[PDB]
Design an enzyme around this catalytic site. Structure first.
Site, mmCIF file in Angstrom:
data_model
loop_
_atom_site.group_PDB
_atom_site.id
_atom_site.type_symbol
_atom_site.label_atom_id
_atom_site.label_comp_id
_atom_site.label_asym_id
_atom_site.label_seq_id
_atom_site.Cartn_x
_atom_site.Cartn_y
_atom_site.Cartn_z
ATOM 1 N N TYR D 173 0.840 -1.181 0.000
ATOM 2 C CA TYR D 173 0.000 0.000 0.000
ATOM 3 C C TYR D 173 0.880 1.237 0.000
ATOM 4 O O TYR D 173 1.918 1.260 0.654
ATOM 5 C CB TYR D 173 -0.920 0.008 1.214
ATOM 6 N N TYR D 183 -2.597 5.450 8.874
ATOM 7 C CA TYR D 183 -1.943 4.182 8.604
ATOM 8 C C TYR D 183 -0.778 3.996 9.571
ATOM 9 O O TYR D 183 0.371 3.813 9.155
ATOM 10 C CB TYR D 183 -1.460 4.137 7.153
HETATM 11 N N1 LIG Z 1 -7.821 -3.704 2.094
HETATM 12 C C1 LIG Z 1 -7.119 -2.792 1.420
HETATM 13 O O1 LIG Z 1 -7.577 -1.687 1.140
HETATM 14 C C2 LIG Z 1 -5.704 -3.126 1.036
HETATM 15 C C3 LIG Z 1 -5.050 -2.321 0.112
HETATM 16 C C4 LIG Z 1 -3.751 -2.637 -0.243
HETATM 17 C C5 LIG Z 1 -3.149 -3.761 0.302
HETATM 18 N N2 LIG Z 1 -3.795 -4.528 1.192
HETATM 19 C C6 LIG Z 1 -3.083 -5.702 1.710
HETATM 20 O O2 LIG Z 1 -3.659 -6.927 1.211
HETATM 21 C C7 LIG Z 1 -3.528 -7.963 2.188
HETATM 22 C C8 LIG Z 1 -4.888 -8.581 2.463
HETATM 23 O O3 LIG Z 1 -5.679 -7.658 3.204
HETATM 24 P P1 LIG Z 1 -7.264 -7.556 2.983
HETATM 25 O O4 LIG Z 1 -7.630 -6.152 2.606
HETATM 26 O O5 LIG Z 1 -7.687 -8.704 2.098
HETATM 27 O O6 LIG Z 1 -7.757 -7.816 4.487
HETATM 28 P P2 LIG Z 1 -8.432 -9.206 4.961
HETATM 29 O O7 LIG Z 1 -8.850 -8.972 6.388
HETATM 30 O O8 LIG Z 1 -9.461 -9.670 3.956
HETATM 31 O O9 LIG Z 1 -7.183 -10.220 4.873
HETATM 32 C C9 LIG Z 1 -6.148 -10.224 5.854
HETATM 33 C C10 LIG Z 1 -5.900 -11.670 6.239
HETATM 34 O O10 LIG Z 1 -4.720 -11.861 7.040
HETATM 35 C C11 LIG Z 1 -5.078 -12.725 8.126
HETATM 36 N N3 LIG Z 1 -4.138 -12.659 9.277
HETATM 37 C C12 LIG Z 1 -4.133 -11.735 10.250
HETATM 38 N N4 LIG Z 1 -3.127 -12.012 11.116
HETATM 39 C C13 LIG Z 1 -2.499 -13.124 10.678
HETATM 40 C C14 LIG Z 1 -1.422 -13.864 11.155
HETATM 41 N N5 LIG Z 1 -0.775 -13.488 12.289
HETATM 42 N N6 LIG Z 1 -1.028 -14.961 10.468
HETATM 43 C C15 LIG Z 1 -1.657 -15.329 9.346
HETATM 44 N N7 LIG Z 1 -2.701 -14.632 8.872
HETATM 45 C C16 LIG Z 1 -3.141 -13.525 9.519
HETATM 46 C C17 LIG Z 1 -6.494 -12.271 8.454
HETATM 47 O O11 LIG Z 1 -7.245 -13.204 9.230
HETATM 48 C C18 LIG Z 1 -7.081 -12.138 7.068
HETATM 49 O O12 LIG Z 1 -7.510 -13.409 6.581
HETATM 50 C C19 LIG Z 1 -2.921 -7.312 3.428
HETATM 51 O O13 LIG Z 1 -1.521 -7.600 3.446
HETATM 52 C C20 LIG Z 1 -3.132 -5.821 3.222
HETATM 53 O O14 LIG Z 1 -2.101 -5.040 3.825
HETATM 54 C C21 LIG Z 1 -5.056 -4.247 1.563
HETATM 55 O O1 LIG Z 2 -2.721 -2.505 4.072
HETATM 56 C C1 LIG Z 2 -3.988 -2.028 4.017
HETATM 57 C C2 LIG Z 2 -4.256 -0.867 3.305
HETATM 58 C C3 LIG Z 2 -5.559 -0.390 3.264
HETATM 59 CL CL1 LIG Z 2 -5.958 1.105 2.372
HETATM 60 C C4 LIG Z 2 -6.580 -1.071 3.922
HETATM 61 C C5 LIG Z 2 -6.307 -2.234 4.621
HETATM 62 C C6 LIG Z 2 -5.002 -2.704 4.675
HETATM 63 O O2 LIG Z 2 -4.739 -3.874 5.350
HETATM 64 C C7 LIG Z 2 -4.452 -3.878 6.683
HETATM 65 C C8 LIG Z 2 -4.353 -2.656 7.326
HETATM 66 C C9 LIG Z 2 -4.069 -2.618 8.678
HETATM 67 C C10 LIG Z 2 -3.897 -3.802 9.379
HETATM 68 CL CL2 LIG Z 2 -3.527 -3.734 11.129
HETATM 69 C C11 LIG Z 2 -4.002 -5.031 8.734
HETATM 70 C C12 LIG Z 2 -4.285 -5.075 7.377
HETATM 71 CL CL3 LIG Z 2 -4.422 -6.690 6.569
#
Ligand SMILES: NC(=O)c1ccc[n+]([C@@H]2O[C@H](COP(=O)([O-])OP(=O)(O)OC[C@H]3O[C@@H](n4cnc5c(N)ncnc54)[C@H](O)[C@@H]3O)[C@@H](O)[C@H]2O)c1
Ligand SMILES: Oc1cc(Cl)ccc1Oc1ccc(Cl)cc1Cl
Ligand SMILES: NC(=O)c1ccc[n+]([C@@H]2O[C@H](COP(=O)([O-])OP(=O)(O)OC[C@H]3O[C@@H](n4cnc5c(N)ncnc54)[C@H](O)[C@@H]3O)[C@@H](O)[C@H]2O)c1
Ligand SMILES: NC(=O)c1ccc[n+]([C@@H]2O[C@H](COP(=O)([O-])OP(=O)(O)OC[C@H]3O[C@@H](n4cnc5c(N)ncnc54)[C@H](O)[C@@H]3O)[C@@H](O)[C@H]2O)c1
Ligand SMILES: NC(=O)c1ccc[n+]([C@@H]2O[C@H](COP(=O)([O-])OP(=O)(O)OC[C@H]3O[C@@H](n4cnc5c(N)ncnc54)[C@H](O)[C@@H]3O)[C@@H](O)[C@H]2O)c1
Ligand SMILES: Oc1cc(Cl)ccc1Oc1ccc(Cl)cc1Cl
Ligand SMILES: Oc1cc(Cl)ccc1Oc1ccc(Cl)cc1Cl
Ligand SMILES: Oc1cc(Cl)ccc1Oc1ccc(Cl)cc1Cl
Lengths: 289, 284, 282, 289
Positions: D173, D183
């Site tokens: 991100y 963040y």
């Molecule tokens: N949601 C967004 O806007 C966004 C944007 C850019 C990047 N991301 C990244 O994409 C990835 C997925 O996030 P998401 O948005 O799908 O959220 P999500 O909650 O759908 O997925 C996060 C997953 O990680 C798991 N997790 C948490 N702690 C863990 C641990 N200690 N060991 C193993 N698994 C664990 C959670 O249970 C969940 O299944 C993350 O790395 C996040 O930083 C998210």
């Molecule tokens: O990286 C992310 C970026 C965005 Cl915009 C939204 C969710 C994201 O995902 C996370 C953000 C904070 C924590 Cl504690 C854990 C996760 Cl998986």
């Protein structure tokens, strides 16, 4: 008279010393924070005069390097509570006290008052001699704890004790941005985080205290820590003196004067930056032969 | 005593002037390079003391004010239409080559070179609607001019000498309003700063950098399109530092860039913009 | 069936061809724009089946048109190039002319490709380059991308896609890549962003550029620059594969497909990972 | 037929699930690593066909997804020897076993053979609601252990069990490169390290295994994790939808298809990269109104 705390100087061979010298050129007094296991060793070489040779400021002892104080500091600990029983038991830490980041913070502020400048020229990796791939969770987080989080701790504890318009500087390395095999243990990851954290700190310190923070991405210097790695440091130096746009040899004082500049009012509109001080080697695609 | 040629000053409201001021602080003598269509007016203003208020640093020492058109590399490039033009007839030696010869003959080797000029006739047009001639002129006056300055001046420059130019972040992040290929020109100029650092560094031990400046109400900035008032306000609202950006702020970084204290910095783009470039967007 | 217009193919030894091939794998029809002073020779070798070797997988070539990306519209062609033997046999070759010609015969297309550069002093160092040489490098290699987009994009499907090719000497110093070409490549990458803003908001059209590794193309062969660069890439890139024309082609195909409909304004490295290294790893 | 192991997934509201979907349409078979605390629930949701609609891929209706297997996985533990006692006796784990990184890797090699594809879509940090400045060393280092080191551990444990020419992708991100207030907790630092690590890992995985690694910098998605922080995520989605060069809504399959492509042999010569899948928001200076 203005003061700068320089966390992370262990001798006259590093970048912190080079920074101290160039700050002397413009009459700011220096307070070093020394890692405890070498603190006595240091305060000794300083009492005997082994560094008088190194406290010459180009005009040769018509002007001296004003070392206002020297304190024990283990940026591995943010406050006393954090200190574990065993490091309190260690033969090197028995003698010494008040060395957590908050301890030295409070100490300096209680005596000297608010200061203007803050330098972070320290780092440590347990498994630096491992590839990032072969690196362990503990070593990796140790690198990052000592080399990255330490800057954040310093700002947290110090910046409320600092002058408005004040300035913080740290050192980094380009392995964060471009792969340098040999810079291991998650040290590249730590520097990468330091650079990113520099920006995020620039926002919080900028808005809250009007304080600035930048990092200097330095070229290869044969310091003590550098020496540790079958002489990875000699190779980076001969590679640099050979292929940099500037065929000069990099001095601690080259980084020294850029830090001094970054710490002054002359750069009061520059914050959050990674300024390269490596004789322009970062601009190169590769060896030009 | 050290000298700096500053190409691209036409009054006291832009960055060229602020750099001159900061250079005076460390005893550097300044030669101004002046676009001819504005030359006699600038010299009159100067002579009648309009800039006296703005000369106070004691006061800035202007060693010389020469005519310079950074669109012409040498005499032969100069078209007849301009040689016959109302605002050039009385003026001579205004090629990049001619002023470098002039200055060199009159003072010898110089140590510092400042590029602070840009021009683009179609900056009101989106890049998309920008014509091949507009686009190319923008790059001719704003990027190529930098290489030519270096080509002609760096034989005549002291080893360890230094070159700085000005840029804007439009080159790296999309800024609508900044058109006619100016975003393209700044981009090329940033890349060119790198490449020149290799050749200038290896050949003459000369350094070259560029400062990415934040918004400043210069006469040029003002001629763009209310736009700069928006960029100033947005900057003063959302920069990490909420300070107001001054020409001297860029000035002091240039001065530092033009001195031996930065003798291990080269090829670099340095941001002097109150931290604005580090933000994702507005924090409100 | 979807159509892609590919400017910058004079033969089959380049990236444009590789992009055609990989697109053919996807059932996308293809139109070639060719530099007039080689259009007569290209069409001939395509006549004799000389290209049937590389065409196979079959590459369905819709059309081949003479395109000179130096000229934006008819009125820019000067007296002299009209009266030149290289062009004599050929007209309708300005960016606007082939854009109209293409739209009249085929209607709106979905995909555009820019794979052409030129500069007449690429042999000189950037510091030794002249204003006309420098500006030529930029006109041909850089503005042309904006001229293609300006003329082709009103004739494209909402959701359409553009890609161009670039090289890393825009971001890192590569002695040898002179004549203002590094300079033209820096503009091109910046322009890819600004164009992405306007094309995206106006026509929902994406645009990306690919920063490719060394390939022994025709143009690359006149510099022994490219031989050196291929050896260096093959020795020091993180991946040891020899880089294929179709590796760029396959990322291209992806970028021109709705599978990348959230990617725009980007510079994508297809160079076996070489960009990521500090230097030689010995 | 090729297999991909997707680490961070737990409900079909996230990107892990979106990548699952797009790999599906390429006929790749998918395995789910799932954080133990939420594992029992996820399987009870799935076996009751609650995600039955989210498994649909054109043609519809229908041409469904088929999950090869679903394992428990705590990526904050590298091997059994690590997992402490307090956690051995936790209500969520006294019911589960073999969830350490190396544990799940070995289980998978045994049962399925070598695999081609690996996806890291997991992240966590206790203090994310805190600004970086106000973040503790424990919270910070936790963010970085879970969010960054995980990428390395996974890679260390799966690389010998992976096909030559296999691929890996993680999610990042832009807060790592530009300041994103909100963040916190060291997540920005985590992502910066992650992106830098992606390069270093690409060198080692690429030379030793001919294995590729890239990361994707995704735009905001209203996933479960993003929901936690007065709705940081609603603001970020709106901002993006308003000011991105492309006005569309960004879907988990937008990232999913970019991932599937990075995970396939079409991106044969692409490695070490941070790829932006964010409708181009990364390129804008700021709000264009
Ligand atoms: N949601 C967004 O806007 C966004 C944007 C850019 C990047 N991301 C990244 O994409 C990835 C997925 O996030 P998401 O948005 O799908 O959220 P999500 O909650 O759908 O997925 C996060 C997953 O990680 C798991 N997790 C948490 N702690 C863990 C641990 N200690 N060991 C193993 N698994 C664990 C959670 O249970 C969940 O299944 C993350 O790395 C996040 O930083 C998210
Ligand atoms: O990286 C992310 C970026 C965005 Cl915009 C939204 C969710 C994201 O995902 C996370 C953000 C904070 C924590 Cl504690 C854990 C996760 Cl998986
Ligand atoms: N030397 C180079 O080539 C080079 C290049 C780029 C960046 N840097 C950076 O410059 C900075 C200074 O490095 P240097 O080369 O001057 O090394 P140095 O050995 O001169 O200084 C490092 C000092 O940090 C202190 N230190 C180590 N662990 C500590 C801890 N846990 N708590 C408190 N203090 C601790 C030690 O006293 C040591 O003397 C470092 O951050 C380094 O990463 C160095
Ligand atoms: N003002 C800002 O907000 C800002 C921000 C970032 C960067 N910059 C850059 O700073 C530099 C200085 O600009 P400024 O804002 O001080 O504007 P300015 O109007 O004060 O200076 C520009 C000068 O260039 C001269 N010039 C134009 N064409 C010329 C030519 N062909 N030959 C010689 N001189 C010519 C003009 O007469 C003028 O004196 C420019 O490169 C500009 O792009 C300005
Ligand atoms: N080959 C490499 O190593 C390499 C690496 C990175 C990027 N690129 C880029 O990829 C693209 C393709 O180049 P290539 O290496 O495949 O060489 P190539 O010879 O296949 O392509 C050059 C083409 O451009 C055409 N051309 C030249 N001037 C033209 C004009 N005025 N109008 C229309 N067409 C014109 C030539 O006829 C030729 O067909 C170029 O943009 C190049 O910069 C190439
Ligand atoms: O950051 C550095 C970069 C270089 Cl080229 C040389 C030395 C450096 O300094 C260190 C490197 C590794 C460790 Cl474990 C500790 C320190 Cl102080
Ligand atoms: O580069 C600039 C950036 C900003 Cl924010 C404001 C003014 C600038 O300067 C120029 C802009 C357009 C033209 Cl035609 C000429 C110049 Cl000197
Ligand atoms: O961009 C390129 C990059 C490389 Cl490594 C090799 C060839 C390239 O292509 C060109 C380079 C210079 C000129 Cl004048 C024209 C072209 Cl087509």
């Amino acid at each position: 008279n203005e003061i700068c705390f320089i966390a992370g100087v262990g001798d006259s061979n590093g970048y912190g010393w080079g920074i101290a010298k160039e700050l002397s050129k413009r009459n700011v007094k220096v307070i070093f924070g020394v890692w405890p296991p070498v603190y006595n060793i240091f305060i000794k070489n300083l009492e005997s005069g082994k560094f008088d040779k190194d406290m010459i400021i180009n005009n040769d002892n018509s002007k001296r390097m004003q070392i206002l104080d020297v304190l024990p500091l283990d940026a591995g600990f943010d406050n006393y509570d954090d200190i574990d029983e065993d490091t309190k038991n260690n033969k090197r830490y028995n003698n010494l006290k008040n060395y957590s980041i908050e301890e030295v913070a409070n100490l300096i502020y209680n005596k000297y008052g608010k200061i203007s400048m803050l330098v972070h020229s320290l780092a440590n990796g347990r498994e630096v001699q491992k590839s990032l791939l072969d690196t362990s969770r503990d070593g990796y987080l140790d690198a990052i704890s000592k080399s990255s989080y330490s800057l954040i701790s310093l700002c947290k504890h110090f910046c409320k004790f600092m002058n408005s318009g004040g300035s913080v500087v740290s050192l980094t390395y380009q392995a964060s941005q471009k792969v340098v095999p040999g810079y291991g243990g998650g040290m590249s990851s730590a520097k990468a985080a330091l650079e990113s954290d520099t920006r995020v700190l620039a926002y919080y310190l900028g808005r809250k205290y009007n304080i600035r923070i930048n990092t200097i991405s330095a070229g290869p210097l044969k310091s003590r820590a550098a020496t540790a790695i079958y002489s990875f440091i000699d190779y980076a130096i001969d590679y640099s003196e050979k292929y940099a746009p500037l065929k000069k040899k990099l001095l601690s004082t080259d980084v020294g004067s850029v830090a001094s500049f970054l710490l002054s009012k002359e750069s009061s509109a520059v914050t959050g930056q990674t300024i390269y001080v490596d004789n322009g080697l970062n601009i190169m695609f590769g060896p030009d032969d």
